[PDB]
Amino acid sequence: TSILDIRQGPKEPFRDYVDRFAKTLRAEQASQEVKNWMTETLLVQNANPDCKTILKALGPGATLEEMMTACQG
């Protein structure tokens, strides 16, 4: 239930993970600043080795679609 425990499985498709992430966070009780920061922080930090590598590589300015396409696979 905690957004903090939303973690991507080794074989779990990225888009599956981001889906679980987005839906936990929307129902999460927090301010808007925090949610941005959780999005900017946890999403990358909780991803699997490879998707973490690919995301950190794109940068904080990366867009969700950029992230989707790169991790598609």
Partner: peptide, 12 residues
């Protein structure tokens, strides 16, 4: 991305 990026894609 930002929280706003997740709301546009997955919704509120």
């Amino acid at each position: 991305i930002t929280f706003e990026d997740l709301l546009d894609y997955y919704g509120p």
